Design an enzyme around this catalytic site. Structure first.
Site, PDB file in Angstrom:
ATOM      1  N   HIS A 104      39.312  40.691  36.765  1.00  0.00           N
ATOM      2  CA  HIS A 104      39.782  39.450  36.067  1.00  0.00           C
ATOM      3  C   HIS A 104      38.443  39.161  35.296  1.00  0.00           C
ATOM      4  CE1 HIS A 104      42.898  38.724  39.474  1.00  0.00           C
ATOM      5  NE2 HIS A 104      43.336  39.497  38.467  1.00  0.00           N
ATOM      6  N   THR A 131      42.547  32.440  44.043  1.00  0.00           N
ATOM      7  CA  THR A 131      41.873  31.837  45.064  1.00  0.00           C
ATOM      8  C   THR A 131      41.853  30.399  45.191  1.00  0.00           C
ATOM      9  OG1 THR A 131      39.841  32.163  43.821  1.00  0.00           O
ATOM     10  CG2 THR A 131      40.264  33.977  45.301  1.00  0.00           C
ATOM     11  N   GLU A 190      46.077  42.692  42.495  1.00  0.00           N
ATOM     12  CA  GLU A 190      46.889  41.227  42.746  1.00  0.00           C
ATOM     13  C   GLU A 190      48.023  41.565  42.317  1.00  0.00           C
ATOM     14  OE1 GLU A 190      43.948  38.046  42.161  1.00  0.00           O
ATOM     15  OE2 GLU A 190      43.826  38.159  44.502  1.00  0.00           O
ATOM     16  N   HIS A 201      35.129  39.101  37.742  1.00  0.00           N
ATOM     17  CA  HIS A 201      35.140  39.633  39.032  1.00  0.00           C
ATOM     18  C   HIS A 201      36.176  40.503  39.179  1.00  0.00           C
ATOM     19  CE1 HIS A 201      37.755  36.273  39.020  1.00  0.00           C
ATOM     20  NE2 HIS A 201      38.416  37.140  39.803  1.00  0.00           N
TER      21      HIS A 201
HETATM   22 ZN   LIG Z   1      40.259  37.297  40.264  1.00  0.00          ZN
END
Ligand SMILES: [Zn+2]
Length: 258
Positions: free
Chosen positions: A117, A197, A104, A92
């Site tokens: 990722h 997450t 990120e 994703h």
């Molecule tokens: Zn990720």
């Protein structure tokens, strides 16, 4: 749980339901290129995707996952900092509302437009759900995206997005080759961290490639037409689905390259 990346449920709020948000090995982090040390103990990295079998693409309300058949060792990551074999389960992305944010991880505080990722689980634990409970349970290959030339190997993803606009929608997505998303060089940084997450579990060996890939403005603009919301609900563009850098605490980031 009702976490997200909105005005009222965003990363700064996650700790209330997920206290490990404030843990000792949280991700992502800023990679200070002048502190990361070359590590000669790192073995060669092996990205073995020739037999990858993609199956489906799903909008999960926080990103989209391209899902793989992980019922056997078809697409695996080995070597580098890893012991044993890690099986590809999904990839994703995280991206911004504009090109100046979206990644990120950061590199000397630089934010990239997006970050890919590729998520793999350690086969010694048998299944993904067990693996996320172990400090060496996952290996995530992180690849930065900048906006420039189009990435040909990305366009099959871009072109299916209109079919999975809203949360809960999926589409068949077979025969997709993740090798088309790699940069030329596999030089990387590595450190121990977490899922980015919820549930934010501290189960990940991060392997973040130094070379970004380039995608076109048209490609990223299509990602930004996705929706966080479900069908028929008030439209909330799926943008800025990234967690900011977290404290490094005691950790050391190692470089694979001199
Ligand atoms: Zn990720």
């Amino acid at each position: 749980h009702h976490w997200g990346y909105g005005k009222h449920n965003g990363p700064e709020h996650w700790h209330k339901d997920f206290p490990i948000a404030k843990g000792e090995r949280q991700s992502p982090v800023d990679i200070d290129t002048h502190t990361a040390k070359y590590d000669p103990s790192l073995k060669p990295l092996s990205v073995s995707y020739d037999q990858a079998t993609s199956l489906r693409i799903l909008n999960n309300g926080h990103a989209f996952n391209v899902e793989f058949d992980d019922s056997q060792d078809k697409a695996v990551l080995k070597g580098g900092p890893l012991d044993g074999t890690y099986r590809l389960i999904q990839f994703h992305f995280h991206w911004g509302s504009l090109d100046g944010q979206g990644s990120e991880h950061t590199v000397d505080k630089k934010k990239y437009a997006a970050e890919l990722h590729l998520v793999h689980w350690n086969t010694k634990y048998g299944d993904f759900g067990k693996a996320v409970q172990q400090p060496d349970g996952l290996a995530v290959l992180g690849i930065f995206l900048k906006v420039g030339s189009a990435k040909p190997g990305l366009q099959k993803v871009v072109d299916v997005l209109d079919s999975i606009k809203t949360k809960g929608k999926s589409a068949d997505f077979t025969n997709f080759d993740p090798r088309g998303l790699l940069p030329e060089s596999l030089d990387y940084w590595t450190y121990p961290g977490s899922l980015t997450t919820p549930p934010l579990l501290e189960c990940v060996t991060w392997i973040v490639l130094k070379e970004p890939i380039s995608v076109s403005s048209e490609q990223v603009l299509k990602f930004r037409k996705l929706n966080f919301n479900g069908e028929g609900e008030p439209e909330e563009l799926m943008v800025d689905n990234w967690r900011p850098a977290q404290p490094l605490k005691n950790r050391q980031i190692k470089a694979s390259f001199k």
